[PDB]
Amino acid sequence: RPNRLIVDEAINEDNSVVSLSQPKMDELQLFRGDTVLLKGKKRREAVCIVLSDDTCSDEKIRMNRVVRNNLRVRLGDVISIQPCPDVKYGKRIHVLPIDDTVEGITGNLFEVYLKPYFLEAYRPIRKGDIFLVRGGMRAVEFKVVETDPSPYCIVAPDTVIHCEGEPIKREDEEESLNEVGYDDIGGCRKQLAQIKEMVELPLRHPALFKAIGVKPPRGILLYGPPGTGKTLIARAVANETGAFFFLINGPEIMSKLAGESESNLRKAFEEAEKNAPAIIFIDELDAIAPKREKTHGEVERRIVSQLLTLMDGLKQRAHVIVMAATNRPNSIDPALRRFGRFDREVDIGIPDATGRLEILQIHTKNMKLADDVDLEQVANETHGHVGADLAALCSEAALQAIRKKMDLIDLEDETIDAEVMNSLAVTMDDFRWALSQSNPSALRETVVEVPQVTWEDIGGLEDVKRELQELVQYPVEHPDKFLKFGMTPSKGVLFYGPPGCGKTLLAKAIANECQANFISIKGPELLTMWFGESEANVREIFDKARQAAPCVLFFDELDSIAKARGGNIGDGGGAADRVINQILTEMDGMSTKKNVFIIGATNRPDIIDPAILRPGRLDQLIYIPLPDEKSRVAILKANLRKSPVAKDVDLEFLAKMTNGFSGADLTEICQRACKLAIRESIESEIRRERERQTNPSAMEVEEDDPVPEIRRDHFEEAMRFARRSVSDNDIRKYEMFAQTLQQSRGFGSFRFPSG
Amino acid sequence: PELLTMWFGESEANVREIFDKARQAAPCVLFFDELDSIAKARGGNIGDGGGAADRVINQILTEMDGMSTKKNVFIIGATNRPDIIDPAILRPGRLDQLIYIPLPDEKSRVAILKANLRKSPVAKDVDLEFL
């Protein structure tokens, strides 16, 4: 039967769209905009409008949430689709709002909600369905109770709409909305895919795999900083697959007077095991099963042992699945990782860059943003925030917007009419004000992300690009030839050269091109884990790097310890041995199959430990020279993209004139150019202001006080105070080391001996 | 690296269980690599691991002298800087015989080139004598 299709998550959020692949339209002779009739479970029915979309597969149908609840089906089931061309324009429509959606509106719902939603839409509806309308601050659902003709009709301008009456009370099998689905999660695509991979099958079809016989998972650990939304993920999964989500809180089991805590745990487990595909969620696991030495009393030991024995006693059952949420995966008791207990660990990292954009677009759904709002700019500016912080920021912005216009009713016991409340355009000013007075929470957290620097930010280093390409991209692209030819791929690369230049940009660019996460460790951190402890930090950072493969670990300023202990200070050498031994050991213990590179940059190469430069460790050495002439003009071109231009002075002339400079110096010069431009513009504005205060209305209209374009004179002023950052002696020393390492490589070719 | 790590504290335990594990799983050939690293890290601008150095060497020596000939446990130590090793090691009963490994020459070079020449893709290739 080539008519049925399996439902799937959609992208278009309109209430009357479906996404079919073009071969399906070719097979079923389906046009665009036709009316199709959809049959599903429970003998429910609805109509929709076909839209073209190539992303979905041929056997797969994409559809939104309102129609999915209309059909009383969940994702992964089957529906029947057909053309339905006999529908004609309706005559009259009777709609009635739901009781638990309009609490406190008391206004003309027809002019507020129905009129824009039904405008020039031609949305076909069927009697008995429910559709959701976005509005001022809330969402209102209407259940169409009567239409002419029945059951099918199409919206036309000359149709009768009745929106008066006692709101209908909620149904039972309606699958109440406002419950979190898959659209309420953003910035967690990969981890959500991983969770859905191993939980969908044992929950949707429970008997089939058991008949086959496999070991289904019996525990999933979700660990991450608080506020990232782990409970949201668990609740969304439970409400989507179909289960009996039974949360048990952390402190609630500790507040009970001793004896009945174990009784509560036992009752919870025995209740959850009977309701069939159940999903228990132990929130705040570390509160009841902490590290062993933390516990002092005896009730904690009894509670922990009770939990462990219940977990071991869970044998198959009705496919009950337990998930526990913790803060960091080293605080729980180590005994809760044996096989059979919690064994699969899935992390939920802090959203970065784009993820903040999706979170903000999810939260700023109901509110009517003004056209000047740039959500992308706010997302780019704000970092160190988690989901809860963004929600609080949006709420504070809404309240700031609503307070300055408190002349609305302030007296009427009946709540505000939707009319004025729909005339609130939250602007950029409110968002900036709310952002100003808000303290973040993440802050000091290691950031794992994809850097956005392209291979155009740098201009020179043409052959170093080739070397890095060979070292990095090929092993993950064509492993077959490497494994056949016999070589083990290189695991480390060490950079060395004059300070500044472009090491960090090279690392970020290669991480971007290879499309893998980037983790940076600075010298200050190395010394921080050099004056006190030395072991914990290295273990945790390497574990984090390994778990997020692929990634490009970076060790900036590896020579800092050698510089520090090379002076009068001679006591921290033991910790230096500690740090170097940790780095050596957890490079030696890394399996070559895992794709985790290591890159280190040193200003002074000679004084570093020669034990590192051994096979199986950082081996390849790449020399990074000082850019000269032709590279420098590209450096300037890359730097001065900014926003203004320099159409007057020639870049090539200053490239020729400034030979022997590092990139940092050129960026400094370009920055002082902007500083001079800002000074001149601001002093011009001040002069213009005072010349109005001398004579009121001196100029009715203003002019272009110095145009945002960096002139030549600013360039000369900024260039007059120029610096030669590096002296020649370091250049000779680096060249001497280069020729010394090259002198071991000396030989006078061949003649094809013994052909 | 592990030997250098076990200076700072844990200078008794780790040696104890490694020797115990070597003894219980007899026969075995215990291997100590980079034995000169002790005094190599000892010498420098720090001079603070010297107590750690002597304690590690002394647990090694005490456990070595406690061996019994009944168990076939063989100890081999390797180093590349012999002039710096503590002389107390070189006594009868402890590590005594000294064997010098010279650089490969002629037939040794051919043999190692052949040994490294297994691979899957060697094709038919050419002579290795001249290399």
Ligand SMILES: Nc1ncnc2c1ncn2[C@@H]1O[C@H](COP(=O)(O)OP(=O)(O)O)[C@@H](O)[C@H]1O
């Ligand atoms: N896509 C999202 N990602 C992360 N957090 C979100 C997202 N959408 C909403 N949130 C916020 O997460 C909060 C719930 O998370 P919470 O249960 O506190 O996690 P935890 O309890 O682990 O800190 C909600 O109040 C919501 O504002």
Ligand SMILES: Nc1ncnc2c1ncn2[C@@H]1O[C@H](COP(=O)(O)OP(=O)(O)O)[C@@H](O)[C@H]1O
């Ligand atoms: N295309 C480029 N070539 C060389 N240097 C550049 C280029 N673009 C920017 N720079 C400058 O080079 C500097 C790199 O120095 P930095 O990353 O701080 O330390 P490191 O010495 O480890 O690279 C940056 O501050 C940046 O301003």
